[PDB]
């Protein structure tokens, strides 16, 4: 089916948080006691790259952002229909800019009366492959709409091992997603300068595990990392949001190490430079956006890293090598890593069959 | 297979096209399977190739399907096939670049011969269709020459070059 699902959040409705305000205005409390039915020997073909739920949560998040961070100037273009100099002029928009707090809140998605949601249970799921241990429910777990690129922030972990997912390998066109099984701490703290620290003792092991899992697809070649190849500042370097501040951070001292079956990285605290901004490139279309000056100071952020986004560089000039650069930026890609299980279904009772009896006439 | 010709110094557009009008992903791949550009959400990411700096794209037509590929400071060695990947098709185009000019920079006289230099891609046979203000319509292939150069032949001769039915106009520096 293609029905409309409603939000469900354990909001507060007393604080100044914009997420709390939106949840209070349009969301309802959670189910007091969930009920899950464990179906038996069934087999259904799951597909995640072609799901339809994401196309709705991605349009709900954008609506959510229209109540928290209003733009001082919202400069976007608009063209006039002319076959071909096609008319194209910039349009200006402006409103008030009152500084407000901002912290994501968990949100639940539920189906209305008449539909159900199947969820898988296999430990691997093969990506877009059929699984058997299925169950039926009416609502999803907690989801945080945290936004970022080049690195997945606070989010659910894997079951028992880090896994890699891709729509079609061997085409150097689709982003590769990786999910870990143990988060790695990150701490960012700071007028226009700040630093970020990540535990190297865990990050080295994480990279080792990722590479070890990765060699299977490409056994003979040698896997090597490399910094971004260039582009907009929002994708060349890590970018995220914290406390009404849009943090941009370079990530060069993490992908310069060429990797083999052995270690070649080093041999405490991994320093990471960061500088805030005021003129950013929007992710909901095209056009710049500007906000009010930053807060006085003393802003801290502590988060966990669970997932990762990696791209590939292929060609016929490759000579026993494989360079994996960091990418991302397609919010749909960032959000498919959370709704790759659930599938919305409707029940059909009717049926026609040939039997051995005959009507009495 | 649309084919275009360069000038060694000007830009050129190679437009794909769609009909959904929803900013669908795409790419621009050379004949060696190397990325050059490509939308990722609403940002831009240049390919790790030899044309990272010169490449560009119009960021206002993405809402209307047309995803051009503007290349600046074009050079001869850049002649090759390119391919779009709009939804699942393989819309592709070809470009050939050859630089036609005059070797004699400024030192010219009256009563001497003038020879032009054409640098065409190795493996192509464009035909130079020259044109002169005095009606000197010298017709030839890639290589052309002139045995006379005097005052009456002033002005940059509009000796174009055509191949496969497509012609590009060039000019020759003439100083006497």
């Amino acid at each position, epitope marked *: 089916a293609t029905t409309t699902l409603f939000c469900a959040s354990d909001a507060k409705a007393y604080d100044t948080e914009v997420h709390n305000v939106w949840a209070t205005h349009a969301c309802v409390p959670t189910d007091p006691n969930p009920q899950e039915i464990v179906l038996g020997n069934v087999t259904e073909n799951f597909n995640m790259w072609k799901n339809n739920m994401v196309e709705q949560m991605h349009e709900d998040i954008i609506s959510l952002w229209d109540q928290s961070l209003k733009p001082c100037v919202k400069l976007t273009p608009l063209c006039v229909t002319l076959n071909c100099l096609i008319n194209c002029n910039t349009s*200006v928009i402006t409103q008030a800019c009152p500084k407000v707090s901002f912290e994501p809140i968990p949100i639940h998605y539920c189906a209305p009366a008449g539909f159900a949601i199947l969820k898988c249970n296999s430990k691997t799921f093969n990506g877009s492959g059929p699984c058997t241990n299925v169950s039926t429910v009416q609502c999803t777990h907690g989801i945080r709409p945290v936004v970022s690129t080049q690195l997945l922030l606070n989010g659910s972990l894997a079951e028992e091992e880090i896994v890699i997912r891709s729509e079609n390998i061997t085409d150097n066109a689709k982003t590769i997603i990786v999910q870990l099984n143990e988060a790695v701490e990150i701490n960012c703290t700071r007028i226009r300068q700040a630093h970020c620290n990540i535990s190297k003792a865990r990050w080295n092991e994480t990279l080792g595990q990722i590479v070890a899992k990765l060699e299977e697809q490409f056994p003979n070649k040698t896997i090597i990392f490399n910094h971004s190849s260039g582009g907009d500042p929002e994708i060349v370097t890590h970018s995220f949001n914290c406390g009404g501040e849009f943090f941009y951070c370079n990530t060069t001292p993490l992908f310069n190490s060429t990797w083999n079956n052995t270690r070649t990285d080093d041999y405490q605290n991994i320093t990471l430079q960061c500088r805030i901004k005021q003129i950013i490139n929007m992710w909901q279309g095209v056009g710049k956006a500007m906000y009010a000056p930053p807060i006085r100071g003393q802003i801290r952020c502590s988060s966990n890293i669970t997932g990762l986004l990696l791209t590939r560089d292929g060609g016929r000039d490759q000579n026993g090598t494989e360079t994996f650069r960091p990418g991302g930026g397609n919010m749909r890609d960032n959000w498919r890593s959370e709704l790759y299980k659930y599938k919305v279904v409707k029940i059909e009772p009717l049926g026609i069959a040939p039997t051995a009896c005959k009507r009495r006439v | 297979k649309k084919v275009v010709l360069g000038k060694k110094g000007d830009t050129v557009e190679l437009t794909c096209t769609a009909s959904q009008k929803k900013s669908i992903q795409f790419h621009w791949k050379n004949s060696n399977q190397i990325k050059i550009l490509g939308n990722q959400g609403s940002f831009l990411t240049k390919g790790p190739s030899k044309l990272n700096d010169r490449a560009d794209s119009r960021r206002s037509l993405w809402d209307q399907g047309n995803f051009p590929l503007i290349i600046k400071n074009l050079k001869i060695e850049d002649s090759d096939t390119y391919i779009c990947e709009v939804e699942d098709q393989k819309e592709e185009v070809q470009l050939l670049v050859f630089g036609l000019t005059a070797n004699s920079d400024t030192h010219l006289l009256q009563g001497q011969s003038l020879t032009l230099t054409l640098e065409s891609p190795p493996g192509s046979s464009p035909s130079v269709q020259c044109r002169s203000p005095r009606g000197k319509n010298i017709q030839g292939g890639k290589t052309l020459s002139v045995s006379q150069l005097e005052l009456q032949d002033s002005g940059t001769w509009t000796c174009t070059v055509l191949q496969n039915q497509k012609k590009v106009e060039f000019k020759i520096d003439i100083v006497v």
Partner: antibody
Amino acid sequence: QVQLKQSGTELVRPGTSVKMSCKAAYTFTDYWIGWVKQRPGHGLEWIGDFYPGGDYTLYSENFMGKASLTADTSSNTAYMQLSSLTSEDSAIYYCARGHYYGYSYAWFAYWGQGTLVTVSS
Amino acid sequence: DIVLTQSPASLAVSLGQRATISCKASQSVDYDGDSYMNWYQQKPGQPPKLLIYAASNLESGIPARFSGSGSGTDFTLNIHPVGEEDAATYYCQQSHEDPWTFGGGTMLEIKR
């Protein structure tokens, strides 16, 4: 941090045409550069504004027919060409960067050191 | 064009005292509420820098001493506290519409 540089000082004869260069090194693409002139007792006055990402043009009326700008993003260098030199054309010249879209002029976070030109025989 | 007039022509301040410079325009420049004025500073032997922009938002790296205010055709750049380093020539510019027009410039000298 974006940085700009310019060539050295020049002595030129009147009535000729000369070309100065400004080299910028983040690389600039789809940006929108302008040129500025400084002469004693006149403050400042912007001359020409071009957009390399398409080579878009915008001139000041007073300089019409006097200043021609060009750019080469391959070498990341803009060029100021001026002809019909006189004594009044002796001055300092600066190149100014920014970012794209038409009437931005709000993020001139840097300027070049400037080049001196003197018209004398 | 929008002709700008700055004041005062010459300005002297004792160290540690308030400083103010005014800029006036012949035609309004308000467009959706954002004030399109830029205040630049010039010192001998070095090129000018962007010191204040838009009259409501500060440029990074520049100490917080600077501020701006005003409306319509009367705007004011304020400096506090003044220091020995601030003796220089300050220019007020409009960033509304092309063509653009600089002001007359004002000279600030530290009084000791």
